[PDB]
Design an enzyme around this catalytic site. Structure first.
Site, PDB file in Angstrom:
ATOM      1  N   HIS B 127       0.840  -1.187   0.000  1.00  0.00           N
ATOM      2  CA  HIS B 127       0.000   0.000   0.000  1.00  0.00           C
ATOM      3  C   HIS B 127       0.881   1.245   0.000  1.00  0.00           C
ATOM      4  CE1 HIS B 127      -2.995   2.956   1.365  1.00  0.00           C
ATOM      5  NE2 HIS B 127      -3.900   2.097   0.931  1.00  0.00           N
ATOM      6  N   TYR B 128       0.359   2.344  -0.550  1.00  0.00           N
ATOM      7  CA  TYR B 128       1.194   3.538  -0.639  1.00  0.00           C
ATOM      8  C   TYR B 128       1.460   4.166   0.719  1.00  0.00           C
ATOM      9  CZ  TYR B 128      -3.131   6.402  -0.283  1.00  0.00           C
ATOM     10  OH  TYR B 128      -4.312   6.990   0.140  1.00  0.00           O
ATOM     11  N   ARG B 129       0.712   3.786   1.743  1.00  0.00           N
ATOM     12  CA  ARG B 129       0.919   4.400   3.044  1.00  0.00           C
ATOM     13  C   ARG B 129       2.113   3.784   3.763  1.00  0.00           C
ATOM     14  NH1 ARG B 129      -5.441   4.825   4.185  1.00  0.00           N
ATOM     15  NH2 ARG B 129      -5.704   6.936   3.296  1.00  0.00           N
TER      16      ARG B 129
END
Lengths: 176, 176
Positions: B127-129
């Site tokens: 995930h980009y987080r």
């Protein structure tokens, strides 16, 4: 006025997701104290970019920056990347000393990476720590799933929302 | 076995801190569930690098990786950067789906920079987080200093300590 415990909140818009190949097209800042009370709102700056850069944006960025008005603001702006950086530093210097503040916001690793490439003097103004509100978002979603449901296209609104989101977690997720 | 709630923890060693000049030389992963229980520890991989890359290291890195034995492990390794990425992806795919887990650990923006440049498929698997424990440490420093105060030479111990640091904050800084 300067206070080493004050917090610098920043939000950027970019032409794409690659900090080395894409560029910054908007920036805004807000300074709070260490307890999240707003001290001053910084300038919202659209950064001029050549037309081929605007034309080269992917389909999501073309639509989103188109209908927000940012694309037109970029074309009309006469503020370069370096002038935007200097204008922002001139504001922040009144409120926070060099190297004191983490970079504060949502997923600000992305923002720091763009600043390091394109505005390295401003990037170097921050402490090396990141204060990532989305770290708390992810933890709340997993550990307190409705502290997250108890809780934006203008730049200052986006930053105000990030400060409000951290205030929400300080009050309902963190045990002080 | 796959669960979109599971967390991927990673630790990297590099020849230096600049992804344009430097390369990854060790990687390790651990998968936990959403409540920080170990599901599996992944492979610890020393990534082969030619001698001129090993020569191109500065003083602090040449010494620190020489003394830990990593340099020699890297010299001997028959696992390329791409093969280490594939080996790690083969492990993580058994436990976590694509684009579901944030990167978890400490100082993991720097990790994401190196993965983006040198292992783009593994970087895109996250995930980009970011789930950076140092966001909690910074908040505890300001708002609950005694919690930060009341709380790694090898890669798996290094990750496990990062998991133990988050667990500490969940038990003494997060209210549930």
């Amino acid at each position: 006025m300067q206070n080493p415990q004050n917090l610098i909140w920043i939000a950027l818009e970019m032409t794409g997701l690659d900090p080395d190949r894409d560029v910054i097209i908007e920036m805004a800042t807000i300074v709070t104290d260490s307890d999240l009370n707003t001290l001053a709102e910084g300038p919202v700056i659209a950064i001029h970019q050549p037309e081929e850069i605007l034309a080269g944006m992917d389909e999501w960025n073309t639509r989103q920056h188109g209908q927000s008005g940012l694309t037109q603001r970029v074309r009309e702006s006469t503020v370069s990347m370096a002038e935007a950086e200097a204008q922002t530093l001139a504001f922040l210097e009144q409120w926070v000393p060099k190297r004191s503040s983490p970079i504060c916001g949502n997923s600000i690793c992305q923002d720091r990476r763009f600043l390091y490439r394109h505005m390295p003097r401003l990037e170097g103004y921050f402490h090396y720590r990141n204060l990532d509100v989305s770290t708390l978002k992810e933890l709340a979603a997993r550990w307190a799933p409705q502290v997250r449901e108890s809780f934006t296209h203008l730049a200052l609104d986006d930053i105000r929302e990030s400060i409000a989101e951290l205030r929400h977690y300080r009050d309902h997720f963190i045990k002080l």
